[model samples]
Target chain A: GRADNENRVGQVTGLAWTEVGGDLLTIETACVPGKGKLTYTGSLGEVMQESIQAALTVVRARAEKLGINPDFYEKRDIHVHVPEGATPKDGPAAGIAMCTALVSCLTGNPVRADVAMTGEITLRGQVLPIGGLKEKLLAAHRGGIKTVLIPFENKRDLEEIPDNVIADLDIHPVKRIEEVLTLALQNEPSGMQVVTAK
Target chain B: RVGQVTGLAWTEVGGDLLTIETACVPGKGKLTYTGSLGEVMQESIQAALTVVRARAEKLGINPDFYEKRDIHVHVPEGATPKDGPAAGIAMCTALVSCLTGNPVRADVAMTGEITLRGQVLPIGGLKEKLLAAHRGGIKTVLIPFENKRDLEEIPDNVIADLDIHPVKRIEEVLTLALQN
Candidate 1:
């Protein structure tokens, strides 16, 4: 029964796992031809838009290293949408999620189904700290996420989370987006092969 | 006007001329854009900077100039909040003028949104913009090529008095706005 139900989980190129209604919510990114425009639907705020721009700049700057076509910026537009488009979503917390979604679309790699993550990513690839760690952790736990990734700076915030919630999930405190990619992707990223040893 | 440029603005009341002043100071690369700009306007400045950085070599500018400098974009009359996409070309012109030590033509005005590749995109309020430029004594104006259709909305007398050039790229804006 477990094996049969495993295939029920949805997998898409730009799909990423998030928390909603105590279950895993999938966010999708669509890439289209519109020059370099980045459009977000579902009522996003200014900070979130800026975070996406920062994420895009990082992706463009490291395109070669990431095995993404360096010229994609000139050829495509990216639209990130969270379903239930009526609800307003805002925060830098979605930076990692957006980056992951973009990378998945660009690399044609599906995100790992059992993983969820939150963090603010910088253009320099640093994972910056974010608020609402305890709430996010509980949400992740309730969503049946087996693994959760967070900014290394938020490590101390783990104390605020109950031990029961902590025990149920595999948590990673990461300092870079590269670490997040390795933990959250179903396959080894093509960009990573050059850096890994033979 | 070493680092100063005249940019046209359109308000609810009407169109007015605004001055955008920029300075490149010695520091680690950082942009200090002030004058109570809204989110879209601020992002416009960022896009303008990326355009300039991308074209530094072709523009006869030092590629590493921004790496060793801090840029400040200040619109005068700081108390009045300003916002719009039409100022993109003006900001790019002001920044390039500041970097190249060239003075902007006092009688010229321009408006358009620029992409990272220096392509000029269409902007709004062309009729009001031309009126403002004409009223402000601007002899020449640069507009985006896509907005050429909007020219029909302008009065013939107003159009005759000013030399309006529709540009498809930032290079055209620079050519008309800068005084070499």
Candidate 2:
């Protein structure tokens, strides 16, 4: 009953999920006067909050490779927020989402409206498995999301979804956040290139 | 209990004293916390460790101390579950004392949540915690500056028996709780 909407986006420039029913999530970013800080709202649990730190660390470690300015961390304070602040959300599933949202905001790229994703991210840029695949996919499909990016490790969970749902959605299992950005963003061709390490 | 310090706890049964022990050994930078800590408490330990690492130079410890060492934080009474942000200062004190070879004054107890920037945050169960400290024969208690208003809830007799120091930062907690 709660899965009718799909156009919800985060109001903040950082990262945040839409309400329980809508697939619209939004992320905003800004450079404030302080050490790199993640000012996150929406009643995040400890592990979820820590994952943001890990995601930021991963981005910093690969800034040059990601075509991002290395000095962004020293010059800016990053804030990520999800609306419906009263809802309590936890777990590491939003790791890739956070990484992508941050990169998009930092580089000023826009995320596509038809894509939804779930996965944990490590400091090394590896994507980790998350639970609730069947439910998350069903919700995404109901919200009119056309494509879903999940962890490669969760490839096995694909069997749990109904065939009709699978036929309606484009499910891509990814091994890295780089792959997620590749699938979710419209190509700007300049600042968003992924560079391989020498 | 060479690296162990007693921290006052509040349970359903009222004031209970728990021990928080720490050990530092040579290894890559890692923080290991045992004793069945919940997610929030584990994060609290991380925050405490970060604060200590950030202030290492100011605290007269090597800036690279963490990179060359692993710190373990254990809260004894393993049969009982423990979780809360209030143990931040206690964990910070134990880690510092273990690393610096200083001893924590056994007669003093402290409680407060610490931030990565070294600011001490307010905590809950102040009256119950102070009563636990007093019941454990702790003569001195270090609490957060923001929690100073909670002092009015404790009985005058209990307050009279204890010396309470309101701390705005972890540095103050260390100064008041550690023996040189």
Candidate 3:
């Protein structure tokens, strides 16, 4: 229902756990020049609102390590959006997606197209567990995402996932928000210099 | 050169000083409010913006200001939850000050709900807000003229502490608070 599978900086894939089952969630964000203000829409619940807010703090809190200007926030107004406006979404599941999307939006880095992730995040960027693992994986597998990032704690729950689904997709266990970013976001475009030496 | 205004807020605990900040930059028309403002407070900003838009021509602001620029209204202390309708008048002044290039007087504070036509309406907790204004060392304050009756219920010494101006319209607020 929206643009995808391209080198889009602020558009990333997320997994949704709904009353019916897990559905593919796309986290799309855009920035405009203005004071640091955030706007969210599309039937988001309070928990979902708090989740998005936490994700923003995680990005700003770890700005130095992430190569993000700590003050990028104050220089740009951001919009975090859900694709399907009718879908009533609420869960911590989009934490990684939102943070990654914010990072991508701020840094001009594109998130890897084949990557999709699900999990909540902490203020300090810890990747927390999310339920409905089997459902999420089934949806991810069907949706053509090659690599699925899930909470490290959800690794043990993989026993119930179908072997075909597991074999078809490269599922990775992530214990931190940074882990998801490293795998989901594409590498810097042909860099020419480095400050750190071996 | 303009766009920050002080407001008095009344919470369950008590009234305190609230700072409303507005910034406008070149962009397509978009209005945003930050800080954990309550649902009603969010609408307060919308009402305030509408008032300014209605008077844009008279204020020497481009009538198409909204289409040419993005305006942001923010309350600092991002984590702190802020609400109530009284910040309405202050919000208007902040937006106006930005668009007109008039700086707001830092020592002045105000509280009152503003209607679509720019009429100033009374707010609750006037006593607490006045006391807070005094404690903040504010020299001048603007309140709804309709709230004038309620001031008699306040302490004698409190009313004497500052120049309290009861106003009936947003025009009074701008004249009293802006440094031109």
lDDT, candidate 1, residue A7? 25
Question: Compared with the true structure, what per-residue lDDT tens digits does model 3 show for residues A1-198?
Answer: 133433376778888655456778767676645457787754567888899999998888777777766466686667776644335678889888889888887877778868899999999878999988888888899888899999999999999988899999998999988678878877742223489978
How many Å off is the CA of A179 in candidate 2? Answer: 24
- TM-score of predicted structure 3, chain A: 0.89
Residue clash pairs of candidate 3: none
The alpha-carbon lDDT assigned to residue A114 of candidate 1 equals: 76
lDDT of 3 at B154: 84
* Model 1 residue B159 distance off true place after TM-score fit, in angstroms: 0.7
Order of models, best lDDT first = 3, 1, 2
Docking class of 3: incorrect
Model 1 is docked with a DockQ of: 0.02
Best-to-worst TM-score order: 2, 1, 3
Local accuracy of candidate 1 as per-residue lDDT tens digits, A42-130: 34567767877887787777788778875766666565555333234667777777777777767656677677888888988899888
Highest lDDT: give the candidate number. 3
TM per model?
Answer: 0.54, 0.55, 0.52
lDDT of each: 0.71, 0.70, 0.80
**Model 1 per-residue lDDT at B133:** 87
Which number leads on TM-score? 2
True-structure lDDT of candidate 1? 0.71
Model 3: CA > 4 A from native: A1-7, A188-198, B1-180
